[PDB]
Design a protein around this nucleic acid. Structure first.
Lengths: 67, 276
RNA sequence: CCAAAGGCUCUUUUCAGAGCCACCCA
């Protein structure tokens, strides 16, 4: 079973948007896998600690198109 | 503000540094170089933040660490009575211990200290036998704070290593002595909670000093000494740029957290509580 | 699979910041 809660999905999506609304993210999609940063799947069931961490590692990763 | 943008970026940059790299910059800027990796990351981040950004704060902080009657095995259902009441006055501007107060307390029920208690705390039966009762010592402690002009001329707060000195020890001691829990003691700073949030690292006074590269000074479990060592920790945290805040309170005889989202809490001047 | 993960919560300081609970207090 997956994540159904709308409020959780919405919060996660906003977090993802924060990452996608970066230019490193657009640099990424211009150019471009296994190391390529993959966007966290919001419908997946994850603990708060795990979801946030995945989002943290993902956002750091996208700056491979920055400092 | 755009300058915070620049900070968040340097923060990430400091997040990826190794211990030596961290230890290197701090040395370079002539700052404290001791402490675990997390302590240093934090120390270095505040240096920048501080640099790239260029009171309402407490003038003094009273560090208090009670010692109480105890028993071997440390049973959960034990009725503790305070036997040592120390107070260490920390000047936040000067960042030095200005003065101290220490008194032993003679317990009314457990009149005889167990052997475990005597060896643990180092407080002897003679010291307690000739000591005063809690209400009397509380009176003297309050008169001492009044002489320091705490709450009137100076903004201050109580600070403890944990939440039991206030929520448990002083709490039941008041019940035993039959007096109302003192209002000036209802809110306080739990240094452990702060330390954990600030540096991101259980919590024993002994572990907090260690992760800071500090050595304990004095006899462990001597109320005054622990208090003095806790002050060394608070000083260091203030120097590492942490704004210590009253973060826990007593409400309905129940422990509750104080929101870090509220203006700096000023503690009322001390007043001897009434009986009943 | 992997990766992530103590259970949670807030914020565009989001390459980031902040907090609650649990654990700890003689």
């Amino acid at each position: 079973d997956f994540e159904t809660d709308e409020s959780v999905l919405m919060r996660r999506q906003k977090q993802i948007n924060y990452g996608k609304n970066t230019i490193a993210y657009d640099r990424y999609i211009k150019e471009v896998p296994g190391i390529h940063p993959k966007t966290p799947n919001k419908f997946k069931k994850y603990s708060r600690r795990s979801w946030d961490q995945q989002i943290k590692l993902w956002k750091v990763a996208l700056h491979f198109w920055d400092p | 503000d755009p300058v915070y943008k620049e900070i968040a970026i340097t923060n990430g940059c400091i997040n990826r540094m190794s211990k030596e790299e961290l230890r290197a910059k701090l040395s370079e800027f002539k700052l404290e170089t001791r402490g675990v990796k997390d302590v240093l990351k934090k120390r270095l981040k505040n240096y920048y933040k501080k640099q790239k950004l260029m009171d309402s704060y407490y003038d003094y902080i009273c560090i208090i660490d009670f010692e109480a009657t105890c028993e071997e095995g440390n049973p959960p259902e034990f009725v503790h009575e305070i036997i040592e009441f120390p107070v260490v006055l920390l000047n936040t501007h000067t960042l030095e211990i200005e003065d101290t107060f220490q008194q032993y307390v003679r317990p009314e029920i457990n009149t005889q200290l167990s052997d475990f208690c005597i060896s643990l705390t180092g407080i002897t039966q003679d010291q307690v036998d000739r000591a005063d009762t809690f209400p009397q010592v509380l009176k003297k402690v309050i008169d001492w704070m009044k002489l320091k002009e705490l709450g009137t001329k100076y903004k201050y707060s109580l600070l403890t290593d944990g939440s039991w000195d206030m929520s448990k020890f002083l709490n039941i001691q008041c019940q035993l002595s039959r007096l109302k829990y003192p209002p000036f003691a209802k809110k306080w700073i739990n240094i452990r909670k702060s330390y954990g949030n600030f540096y991101k690292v259980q919590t024993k006074l002994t572990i907090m000093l260690e992760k800071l590269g500090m050595d304990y000074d004095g006899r462990p479990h001597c109320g005054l000494d622990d208090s003095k060592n806790i002050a060394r920790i608070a000083v260091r945290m203030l120097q590492d740029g942490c704004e210590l805040r009253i973060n826990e309170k007593m409400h309905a005889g129940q422990l509750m957290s104080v929101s870090s989202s509220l203006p700096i809490e000023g503690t009322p001047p001390p007043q001897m509580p009434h009986f009943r």
